[PDB]
Design a protein around this nucleic acid. Structure first.
Ligand SMILES: [Mg+2]
Ligand SMILES: [Zn+2]
Length: 2015
RNA sequence: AGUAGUGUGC
RNA sequence: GCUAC
RNA sequence: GUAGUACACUACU
């Protein structure tokens, strides 16, 4: 599937770039490239419009075609020309094609054409409606201004890529990037700046102390250059770049000497780079053990271990009942009957007696049911009615399973002992286990063996559950082996153990919510032997109790307290486990993690044992402590740094790896990591490159081979490199969030900040250096590299300031920016005494009351220098600053420039992210003015970084994966081209001779080397020299001097910023009672005198990422120049690519040379990478930096050898819990979005379905909707199973996986409607498009539908149509209180506006008189303030402002499941107290039968969710029209950006509100699509009805009606870069949908998909012309296939008989080939099928003519020895002269314009010519010239005399490029004539007497006429009578799939089963006589040649073979 | 007891 | 925290 | 100031 070009022209463009040297020649190449892009869009657009593609016809020809009756001279015409014309229903349309991204050239051509044709038109009286059609190439959408043109073509389906023009322009600007005659000519205009952002600067910057320090640090001339550069105004100078050129030429000497010295270091390097090996890992391990022993308390006792899993387990007893009361009685009689005397035994007997109800069970059940009936009858909680414990028998029963701790049944000593020593109620180095010990590893191993012994037995249960019963069909359809592995998981005791711990922990969390201080509760699970006592206590204290018959038959992961002997067997109690509800939340969701981990480690690997995988994964998925976190995150660095070529894994293991082994699984996993480090050294050389298939267009096969030679890490077996990287990188995503205590991480973060600040105060003094001193910057090199990079990026794009002002909204108001109006944290530096002491006395008073039922003034006294701070939200702080008139509604950049002076102190505080690493990171909360100023600086740096092709800003949404792939593929192509070019003579000599000479001849070949530096930077923001950014701001030409001066004054005040210590950190450190010894906190704060520390050199994390990105890419450009000069010293080639993302780096180096060894080059390149980072004040973290040959690794994205790769398991594991617990639909939608992101990153289909199954399971677990539970909707609706219920009513998702990954939870409704169309549309239009099936809904009989279908249509008609803001229906309504909502200023204004005398009605009428800011916000200050007051009435917003843990949200959605939480009033009023779920079900099914379903209801169902979205139309057309092709393996994967299927909401809703379209055509067409629906009047009928039944006019009802109206209009209107990983590169949109359906149907292989009709429709308006274009495309595919099939596979003597036999009785894609051939013969592009029309005999002069009219070739004559005739299309020259002197020269053209004369002179004087024009002549008017070019090169083109003088002047600029005149020769007489026809219709039949080929005929001497090619996979869609030819059926050859290959080897080595399809003899006598009806042309045989590189690989390419390699010979060898 | 910790907490 | 007196 | 502070699982085991 090639894009849009061919061999003939794409190779010519690639050649014409790769030889030129002149800037005029390069500009001509660029203008020809833009012209070819224009011509390509013109051809495809005219093909789409089904009009004739004209060739820039003049107005004379247009009028003489539309009035072919008048005199051709009288009525006038201008001398300009259109692109094409169109005259229909007596209106002439004039058409122009633009491929611009700007709209300005379109309107310039509009008012350039309009007035000249209005001069014409009111003479002949014809409406000339001129049309411009502007395609945007980077985002393909059409801009047709002529709205009188769109009613003929309301949708246009042009689906072409402009990428192969972009890469051509890319390599063109790559080649002449350093040129300067090129750039100023290819400039879009002159360099312009906009208005200043401020009038005045800051004179106080020049006397600021930080500037004084910066200035005194530099030498004197750099002080002069800095001062001279700040005061430089680019707008006031004659050249904008005179400053940058001046400073560059100043520092050039030191720059050149530095690059030359560092490049001369290529010879000083002996190649002993830091390899990893066994000694380095062993010595680093020994240093690690010494460091960890001297930092930890290393214990050798075994019983110092901590619980590896906080749970013990034993299997169930099938002899007992699984009844709740019976299990309660059994737990009581088992706890009381304990034999023996241990410590806590009498306490356990007393607790067994406290839950003893004896024989009184019915009383218990009745009492508890009465209480639950009273609790469930209210939405709110039951208030002011106390719970009395009822003495049932011997238990004081408070609720169901909540018993009172009776002091009469326990004695006080045992009670104290149990609550104190066992439960911990009222109780110096960190102790870890000795991982390095022998007996401790033996004990850990024995634990793993015992757990594998007990848990791998069978359950005895049935293996089915929700996952299996609802999704196992789809899972088994994608992969049977995943279904079998999942069945094997479900059979074992692993799954039952983790399911019991999930169910039991959910019950523990449900039960401990309302547990009291004197009650204990019992939690039960489905296992009738596993129990839990939840102790009185927010955290959870529980203890597992296991009943078991035989002793030692318990799963004990280090958690057991003791086993005891009871009645009927043994009883085991675990220790008390105290957990917070977050880790319990992760335990609840752990079966999803276990199943995902097991099936993902197991996936497609028959060498792994499943019980080993389960034994590892039950401990990693149930790990909720830091002990495994200390192993999973360092394991990446240890195993990858010991796998790599070069790293410092000794320094990482010695200095950074610190295992923290408190459990025994930590010890076992530590030994796994150690043995994998050793083994990873042992297996670097088992990584093999896959063979690379090329075509000179694309790389088809690529990557690493899939050999299982690698040693598996976490469990025994063998493994692939992809599976090895999975086992390395996946366990970091096993870690939990929120495991950190704030208590310790605030101290750790503050210590890190203050230690770096202290060391910088007392040790770091030098700012600039020259010897790579740490935390210094080389000054000359910084300045020179910045001047070079600013000159390149600024002279490339002149309007950069305008781009920065538009894209970042600098000219608009601050209320229109999402960054300044968010809900993030801000900071207020004021005097907040009163509010803090109010909340302090309230929490103390509260504390005292809770201790009755059984400080900030301290800090303000004990700290004098305390600044006072508070943390509001961002939107509230903007509201406060607008209400206090600090900020206004001016343009935001003027306010930022004012704030850069007005705000002089910056305060930053911090808090913990709570991430899943070992040491937590921190985010720095700034105050609001810091956010404004850093917004200005960072948006300037951001939009300068996006100019760079290798700075990863523009595509943050995983386009970095696509960029990595592009870089890797061009480095593969570079390595192949360079090694085959340099070593061509030596390989010719090797093949010549070829034994002994060949190897020593090979010894002197050019060796290829490919290197990838996967670098991290050490302390990126902390140890950074901030003074280099002063040179970045000062050298920037786009800034006025006042703007530079204010931004640098902000920089200087920012180096005086202060870090506020948070108040809880100080409350920690003041209440310590012992002085911490070497206290860095008390030193830096002067013994806690203050809470602020002046942080200076550390700019904080996340504040200057783009500025640092820009200087980091400058450092990498210096590195690139060093490497290029060093490899030119060796006279080799080099390609250096470097990707930069702030603190990450990926530099890839490809070198082909022959002088020295590769190890010395690796040593040089790594030493110079370190030095290039150090010269700009960076330092590459050499402990975390590694070097490979194959693997790239950018920000968690891989690239193996050109094949992209990602750990998709992180998105599978995130999908287990990621939800805010809003409702079932919203939770399910969030989880499925995570599964979609997994699919984009290369997840196989079966694991994606396992993820969707787990998502449905976890969402139904949250709301008690599992089958059989109380909210199971299955018996409350008319449905067979859960697939037949809509997702809004809590059913499961039934859809194809490609449909889920494209839309997701709109796939259920869409697939239901596609099933309805497949069931109910009439039988003739079954295989028709979706628009042709939706229109025939009118012929449905709705009476005899299925009642399930009527129910599902009525839900969608009445509830999904008129909904609010995929949408839900049954959301539970949480009763939350007033939240905090008192720190806010805006809520306070809402409160004293609510209780105001008539103020709220003023707000409501202000909203209603300007209603657009109900679904947007406002431009103005005032309306932003009014709308942010109005958003408090939304209870969703009020509760979203509250801080909230999601674990409590989970527990509350569990517990409020039987309570009436569904507001059925809002459900009922959409189609006409609170309600439970089941009553919502009953009432909805009752009220829905009250409504009626008509045909017009179904019409507006299909018009709302299919026909009004082009995405839904194309997805439905993919599912209807699919044809699945042939299976094949996924050998080369590739990245494809998801296309936009639609070919500001503030602007269009303000436009529709105030009726002003303000960009001019989008708004009026979109308000047409708004006004056309006309369903508005029912709203105001409801308004009048409410005014009737309430008398007075209502306003709140009018606001609710208007909000519903604008939201259901916003859904019609709806006002991202998504990269996928597909088995091939898609280019079009149909290619993407084909690859998406083929990828997502099996794990083992992908299918090719092609479609019947055009799947890209535009809507229900253009039907007939859509069918016309679809049939035209089918005709095109049919005859491309037939012509190439017949001249590729059939005998040359018999093809036209074959062709006529195909044309008569055959049909391609259900359309007869006769009809398709009539379509081609009658269309306007017959020239595309000239050999077809010739072989059938339907070819006319016009066709052929129109062929050389629109397409061409240069023709020379006359090599006699004196007159030359160079003819082209309407272009011919005649040149008359001797060897010395030329007499005259006559050009001949079609039009005489000075552009076309030079174009024709360029093209006609570049073919094979005689001589070099070697004389001159004085000259006065067009002439032929030549410039000289070094080593016998010249350029031959016609200039004007004036242009000869001008270009001689411009190349006589005082420069270094050596001057070459264009010395001119002979006069050119420019005439004009009609060009003759070069291809007569009768001039072919002699020329093709021996050309027997249906797809290629001769038209010239050496010009052919071809038909394009089409893939043979589409040959299965033919249909017809078997063509018996002797013994073969060629119809079966068309339907074959193994024999249609074009390779000779794949048919020669093919099978007899594949050939037995063809045989149909009926009486022959020889195979040789029957095989005569086949091809005799030589086929293509793939030949692979090894590439001389250190990652050694083979390339394979097609060849023409020899004369014997035919098709008949392959069939005969097969036979 | 559990969790966190070469910062005294829960 | 919340609810009632 | 006093009193109150309300609920899920219930399973093939
Ligand atoms: Mg990295
Ligand atoms: Zn036969």
């Amino acid at each position: 599937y090639f894009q849009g070009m061919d061999y003939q022209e794409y190779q010519q463009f690639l050649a014409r770039i790769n030889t030129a040297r002149d800037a005029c020649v390069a500009k001509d190449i660029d203008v020809d490239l833009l012209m070819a892009r224009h011509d390509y869009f013109g051809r495809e657009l005219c093909k789409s419009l089904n009009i004739e593609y004209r060739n820039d016809v003049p107005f004379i020809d247009i009028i003489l075609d539309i009035r072919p009756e008048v005199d051709p001279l009288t009525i006038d015409a201008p001398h300009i020309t259109p692109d094409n014309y169109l005259y229909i229903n007596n209106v002439l349309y004039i058409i122009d094609y633009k491929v611009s991204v700007s709209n300005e050239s379109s309107v310039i051509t509009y008012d350039k054409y309009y007035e000249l044709t209005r001069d014409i038109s009111d003479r002949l009286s014809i409406p000339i409606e001129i049309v411009i059609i502007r395609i945007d190439p980077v985002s393909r959408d059409l801009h047709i201004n002529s709205d009188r043109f769109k009613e003929l073509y309301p949708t246009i389906v042009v689906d072409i890529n402009f990428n192969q023009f972009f890469d051509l322009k890319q390599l063109l600007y790559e080649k002449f990037g350093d040129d300067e005659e090129f750039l100023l000519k290819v400039a879009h205009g002159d360099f312009t700046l906009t208005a200043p952002w401020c009038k005045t600067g800051c004179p106080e910057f020049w006397k600021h102390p930080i500037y004084k320090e910066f200035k005194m640090s530099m030498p004197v001339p750099e002080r002069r250059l800095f001062e001279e550069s700040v005061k430089f105004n680019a707008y006031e100078s004659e050249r904008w770049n005179t400053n940058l050129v001046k400073i560059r030429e100043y520092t050039k000497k030191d720059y050149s000497e530095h690059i030359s010295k560092s490049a001369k270091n290529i010879f000083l390097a002996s190649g002993f780079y830091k390899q990893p090996n066994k000694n380095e890992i062993s010595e680093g391990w020994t240093l690690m053990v010494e460091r960890v022993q001297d930092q930890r308390e290393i214990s050798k006792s075994l019983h110092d271990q901590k619980p590896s899993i906080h749970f013990i387990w034993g299997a169930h007893n099938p002899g007992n009942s699984n009844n709740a009361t019976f299990k309660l009685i059994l737990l009581s009689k088992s706890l009381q009957s304990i034999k023996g005397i241990s410590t806590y035994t009498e306490a356990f007997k007393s607790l067994g007696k406290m839950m003893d109800i004896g024989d009184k069970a019915i009383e218990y059940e009745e009492f508890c049911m009465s209480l639950k009936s009273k609790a469930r009858s209210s939405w709110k909680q039951i208030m002011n009615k106390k719970l009395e414990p009822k003495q049932i028998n011997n238990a004081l029963v408070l609720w169901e399973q909540q018993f009172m701790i009776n002091n009469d049944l326990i004695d006080k000593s045992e009670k104290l002992k149990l609550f104190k020593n066992f439960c911990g109620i009222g109780k110096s180095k960190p102790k870890i286990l000795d991982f390095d010990d022998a007996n401790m590893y033996l004990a850990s191993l024995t634990m793993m063996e015992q757990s594998k012994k007990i848990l791998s037995k069978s359950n005895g249960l049935k293996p089915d559950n929700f996952i299996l019963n609802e999704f196992g069909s789809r899972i088994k359809d994608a992969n049977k082996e995943t279904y079998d592995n999942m069945h094997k998981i479900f059979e074992t005791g692993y799954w039952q153990c983790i399911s019991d711990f999930s169910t039991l922990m959910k019950n523990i969390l449900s039960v401990s919510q309302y547990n009291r201080h004197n009650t204990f509760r019992i939690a039960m699970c489905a296992n009738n032997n596993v129990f839990a006592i939840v102790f009185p206590s927010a955290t959870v204290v529980y203890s597992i109790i296991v009943l078991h018959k035989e002793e030692e038959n318990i799963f004990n992961p280090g958690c057991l307290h003791g086993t005891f002997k009871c009645m009927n067997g043994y009883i085991s109690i675990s220790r008390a486990i105290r957990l917070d509800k977050e880790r319990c939340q992760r335990i609840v969701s752990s079966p999803g993690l276990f199943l995902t981990t097991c099936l993902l480690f197991k996936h497609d690997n028959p060498t792994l044992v499943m019980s080993d995988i389960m034994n590892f994964s039950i401990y990693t998925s149930l790990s909720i402590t830091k002990s495994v976190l200390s192993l999973t995150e360092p394991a990446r660095y240890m195993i990858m740094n010991s796998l790599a070529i070069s790293s410092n894994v000794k320094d990482y293991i010695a200095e950074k790896f610190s295992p923290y082994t408190k459990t025994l699984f930590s010890v076992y996993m530590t030994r796994l990591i150690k043995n994998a480090c050793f083994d990873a050294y042992d297996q670097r050389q088992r990584v093999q490159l896959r063979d690379i298939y090329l075509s000179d267009y694309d790389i088809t096969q690529k990557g690493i081979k899939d050999n299982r030679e690698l040693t598996s890490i976490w469990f025994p077996g063998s493994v692939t490199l992809k599976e090895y990287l999975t086992q390395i990188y996946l366990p970091f995503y096993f870690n939990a969030k929120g495991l950190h205590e704030k208590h310790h991480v605030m101290v750790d973060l503050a210590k890190t900040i203050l230690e770096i600040e202290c060391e910088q105060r007392e040790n770091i003094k030098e700012i600039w250096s020259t010897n790579c001193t740490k935390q210094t910057v080389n000054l000359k090199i910084l300045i020179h590299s910045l001047c070079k990079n600013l000159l390149a990026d600024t002279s490339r794009h002149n309007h950069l300031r305008n781009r920065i002002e538009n894209r970042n909204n600098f000219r608009r108001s601050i209320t229109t920016i999402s960054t300044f109006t968010s809900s993030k944290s801000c900071l207020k530096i004021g005097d907040f005494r009163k509010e803090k002491e109010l909340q302090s006395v309230k929490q103390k008073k509260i504390l005292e009351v809770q201790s009755r039922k059984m400080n900030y003034e301290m800090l303000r006294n004990a700290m004098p220098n305390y600044t006072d701070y508070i943390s509001t939200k961002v939107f509230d702080r903007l509201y406060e600053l607008l209400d206090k008139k600090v900020l206004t509604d001016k343009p935001v950049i003027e306010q930022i420039m004012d704030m850069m002076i007005d705000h002089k102190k910056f305060y930053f505080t911090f808090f913990n992210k709570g991430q899943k690493t070992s040491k937590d990171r921190e985010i720095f909360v700034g105050e609001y003015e810091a956010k404004m100023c850093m917004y200005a600086v960072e948006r300037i740096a951001k939009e300068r970084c996006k100019l760079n092709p290798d700075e990863m800003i523009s595509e943050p949404g995983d386009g970095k994966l696509k960029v990595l792939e592009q870089k890797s593929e061009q480095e593969i192509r570079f390595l192949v081209e360079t090694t085959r070019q340099k070593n061509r003579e030596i390989d010719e000599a090797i093949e010549a001779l070829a034994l002994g000479k060949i190897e020593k001849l090979s010894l002197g070949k050019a060796k290829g080397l490919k290197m990838e530096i996967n670098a991290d930077m050490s302390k990126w923001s902390a140890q950074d020299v901030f003074y280099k950014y002063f040179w970045l701001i000062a050298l920037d030409p786009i800034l006025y001097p006042q703007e530079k001066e204010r931004i640098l004054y902000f920089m200087c005040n920012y180096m005086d910023k202060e870090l506020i210590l948070p108040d809880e950190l100080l409350f920690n450190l003041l209440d310590q009672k012992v002085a911490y010894q070497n206290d860095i906190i008390a030193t830096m704060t002067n013994q806690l005198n203050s809470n602020t520390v002046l942080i200076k050199r550390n700019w904080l994390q996340g504040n200057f990422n783009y500025t640092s990105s820009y200087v980091h890419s400058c450092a990498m450009s210096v590195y690139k120049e060093i490497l290029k000069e060093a490899i030119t010293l060796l006279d080799g080639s080099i390609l250096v690519n470097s990707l930069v993302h702030s603190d990450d780096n990926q530099t890839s180096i490809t070198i082909v040379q022959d002088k020295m060894e590769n190890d010395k080059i690796i040593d040089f390149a790594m030493k110079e990478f370190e030095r290039a980072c150090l010269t700009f004040g960076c330092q590459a973290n050499m402990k975390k930096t590694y070097v490979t040959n194959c693997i790239k690794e950018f920000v968690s994205l891989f690239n193996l050898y050109g094949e992209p790769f990602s750990i998709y398991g992180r998105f599978l594991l995130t999908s287990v819990g990621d939800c805010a617990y809003i409702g079932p639909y919203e939770d399910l939608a969030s989880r499925i979005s995570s599964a979609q992101t997994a699919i984009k990153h290369g997840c196989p289909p079966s694991l994606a379905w396992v993820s969707i199954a787990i998502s449905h399971w976890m969402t139904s677990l949250t709301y008690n909707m599992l089958p059989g539970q109380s909210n199971d909707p299955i018996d409350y609706f008319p449905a067979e199973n859960r697939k037949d219920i809509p997702i809004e009513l809590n059913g499961v998702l039934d859809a194809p996986l490609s449909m889920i990954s494209t839309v997701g939870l709109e796939s259920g409704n869409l697939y239901f409607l596609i099933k309805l169309l497949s069931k109910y549309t009439p039988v003739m239009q079954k295989r028709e498009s979706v628009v042709n099936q939706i229109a025939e809904v009118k012929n449905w009989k709705v009476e005899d539908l299925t009642d399930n279908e009527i129910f599902r249509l009525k839900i969608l008609r009445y509830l999904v149509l008129d909904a609010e803001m995929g949408r839900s229906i049954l959301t539970p309504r949480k009763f939350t209180t007033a939240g905090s909502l008192r720190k806010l200023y805006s809520f306070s204004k809402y409160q004293d506006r609510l209780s105001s005398p008539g103020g709220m009605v003023e707000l409501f009428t202000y909203l209603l008189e300007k209603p657009e800011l109900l679904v947007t916000k406002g431009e103005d200050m005032k309306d932003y303030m009014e709308s942010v007051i109005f958003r408090y009435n939304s209870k969703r917003f009020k509760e979203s402002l509250s801080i909230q843990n999601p674990a409590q949200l989970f527990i509350e959605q569990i517990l409020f499941s039987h309570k009436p939480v569904i507001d059925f009033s809002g459900i009922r009023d959409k189609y006409i107290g609170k309600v439970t779920f089941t009553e919502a079900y009953r009432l909805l099914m009752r009220d829905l039968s009250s409504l009626e379903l008509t045909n017009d209801d179904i019409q507006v169902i299909y018009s709302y969710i299919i026909l009004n979205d082009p995405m839904m139309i194309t997805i439905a057309n993919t599912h209807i029209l699919s044809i699945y092709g042939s299976p094949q393996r996924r050998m080369g994967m590739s990245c494809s950006t998801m296309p936009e299927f639609r070919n500001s909401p503030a602007l269009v809703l303000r436009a529709y509100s105030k009726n002003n379209p303000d960009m001019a055509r989008d708004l009026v067409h979109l308000k047409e699509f708004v006004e056309n629906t006309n369903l508005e009047e029912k709203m105001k009928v409801r308004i009048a009805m409410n005014e009737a039944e309430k008398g007075q006019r209502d306003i709140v009802f009018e606001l609710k009606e208007m909000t519903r109206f604008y939201q259901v209009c916003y859904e019609y209107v709806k006002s991202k870069i998504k990269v996928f990983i597909l088995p091939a590169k898609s280019y079009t949109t149909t290619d993407f949908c084909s690859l998406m359906q083929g990828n997502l149907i099996k794990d083992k292989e992908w299918y090719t998909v092609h479609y019947l009709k055009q799947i890209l429709s535009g809507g229900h308006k253009a039907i007939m012309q859509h069918n016309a274009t679809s049939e035209q495309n089918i005709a095109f595919e049919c005859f491309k296939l037939i012509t190439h099939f017949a001249d590729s596979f059939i005998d040359s003597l018999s093809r036209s008989a074959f062709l006529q036999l195909i044309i008569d009785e055959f049909s391609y894609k259900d359309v007869k080939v006769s009809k398709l051939y009539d379509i081609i013969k009658n269309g306007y592009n017959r020239t595309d099928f000239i050999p077809l029309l010739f072989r059938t005999g339907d070819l006319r002069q016009a066709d052929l003519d129109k062929y050389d009219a629109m397409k061409s070739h240069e023709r020379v004559t006359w090599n006699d020895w004196i007159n030359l005739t160079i003819t082209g299309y309407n272009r011919s020259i005649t040149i008359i002269g001797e060897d010395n002197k030329l007499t005259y020269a006559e050009l001949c053209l079609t039009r005489k314009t000075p552009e076309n004369i030079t174009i024709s002179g360029r093209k006609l004087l570049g073919s094979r010519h005689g001589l070099k024009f070697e004389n001159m002549s004085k000259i006065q008017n067009y002439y032929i010239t030549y410039r000289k070019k070094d080593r016998h090169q010249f350029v031959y083109q016609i200039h004007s005399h004036e242009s000869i003088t001008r270009r001689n002047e411009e190349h006589m600029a005082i420069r270094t490029r050596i001057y070459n005149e264009i010395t001119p020769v002979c006069v050119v007489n420019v005439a004009e004539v009609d060009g003759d026809q070069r291809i007569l219709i009768r001039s072919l039949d002699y020329l093709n007497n021996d050309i027997f080929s249906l797809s290629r005929i001769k038209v010239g001497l050496d010009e052919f006429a071809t038909i394009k090619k089409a893939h043979f996979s589409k040959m299965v869609s033919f249909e017809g009578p078997p063509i018996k030819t002797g013994l073969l059926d060629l119809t079966e050859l068309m339907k074959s799939q193994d024999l249609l290959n074009l390779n000779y080897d794949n048919i020669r080595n093919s099978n007899l089963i594949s050939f037995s399809k063809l045989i149909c003899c009926e009486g022959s006598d020889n195979i040789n006589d029957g095989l005569e009806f086949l091809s005799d042309d030589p086929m293509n045989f793939t030949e692979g040649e090894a590439i001389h590189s250190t990652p050694i690989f083979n390339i394979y390419y097609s060849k023409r073979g020899e004369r014997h390699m035919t098709y008949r010979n392959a069939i005969k060898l097969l036979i």
